[PDB]
């Protein structure tokens, strides 16, 4: 953990934070789909391809049908997709951290922070094996960081950048990082090391809840590139197809 403030001490979040060990979801902490929200067409979130076994929190994403079955694979649902959103809300203040390895699909691997009034924080929208060919050679190996704002800050833009890691994000657990310092203040953390800082718009001082999802994008949209669709040939392949987390772990100071 960065080293904390000022005599203060670094305490878990015990309701935020999961080893992901058990033998299915803690109910208790995670809701195994988006409650608010369908997902991204021609995605939509499918209760339990989220699903917690091998000590991971299993973001699985499958072929609902072929998207030669449906009138426009642009739109047209086809894609079963995964989320977790937290029971508990996120904070200012806390710090947050995942280990996961990303899918190999054409979708995210995401971990970040919405259902807001007015505010986002992604820490990653990670796109592990992008169909448009020409950003094979970049998107695996990025870690795009984001704010974005909407409601009563509708119109602003969104504020993010990025970090090249060393290897690809499907191919390792890493572990990303985001400590919540001030609603002014975002700090972003590769294995550890802190790589990236944002200052938000606007103070980010709202109460949000912390998801880990996966997402068709049929064009760039929401601050994510154009990706391309995914292939049904990795869909229906366990082994390309699931985000796994090892863990989350949050933590707040205490005086
Ligand atoms: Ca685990
Ligand atoms: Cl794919």
Same mark, same amino acid.
């Given at each position: 953990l960065?080293?904390?403030? @000022?005599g203060?001490?670094?305490?878990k979040?015990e309701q935020?934070?999961d080893?992901? @060990?058990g033998n ?5 902490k995670?809701?195994?789909?988006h ?7 021609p995605?939509?979130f499918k209760?339990? @391809?989220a699903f917690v076994s091998?000590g991971?929190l ?9 998207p030669?079955?449906?009138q426009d694979?642009?739109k047209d ?6 989320a977790?959103?937290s029971?508990t809300? &996120?904070?200012?203040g806390?710090?947050?951290? &995942?280990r ?6 054409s979708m995210?691997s ?8 007015f505010?986002?924080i992604?820490?990653?929208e990670?796109?592990? @094996?992008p ?7 970049d998107?695996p190996?990025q870690?795009?960081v984001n704010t974005?704002?909407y409601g ?6 969104p ?9 690809r ?6 572990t990303?990082?985001?400590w919540?310092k001030?609603?002014?203040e975002?700090?972003f953390?590769?294995?550890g090391?802190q790589?990236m800082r944002i200052?938000?718009?606007?103070p980010?001082?709202?109460?949000l809840?912390?998801?880990?999802d996966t997402?068709?994008?049929p ?8 990706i ?5 040939e990795?869909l ?7 985000m796994?987390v090892?863990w989350v772990?949050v933590?707040?100071l205490?005086?």
């Open positions: 960065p080293s904390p403030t @000022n203060k001490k670094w305490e979040v935020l934070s080893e992901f @060990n299915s979801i803690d109910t208790n995670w809701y195994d789909y409650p608010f929200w369908e997902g991204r067409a995605s939509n209760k339990g @391809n091998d991971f299993n973001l699985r994403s499958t072929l609902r049908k072929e030669s079955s449906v694979p642009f649902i086809w894609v079963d997709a995964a977790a959103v029971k809300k &996120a904070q200012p806390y710090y947050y951290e &995942a996961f390895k990303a899918s190999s699909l995210t995401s971990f970040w922070f919405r259902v807001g009034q505010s986002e992604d820490v990653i990670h796109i592990g @094996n169909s448009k060919e020409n950003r094979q050679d998107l190996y870690y795009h974005h704002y009563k800050h509708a119109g602003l833009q504020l993010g950048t990025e970090y090249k890691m060393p290897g994000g499907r191919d390792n657990f890493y990303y990082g985001f919540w001030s609603p002014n975002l700090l953390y590769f294995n090391k790589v200052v938000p718009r606007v980010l001082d709202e109460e809840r912390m998801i880990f997402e068709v994008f064009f760039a949209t929401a601050g994510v590139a154009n391309g669709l995914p292939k049904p990795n229906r392949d366990n082994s390309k197809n699931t796994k090892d772990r933590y707040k205490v005086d």
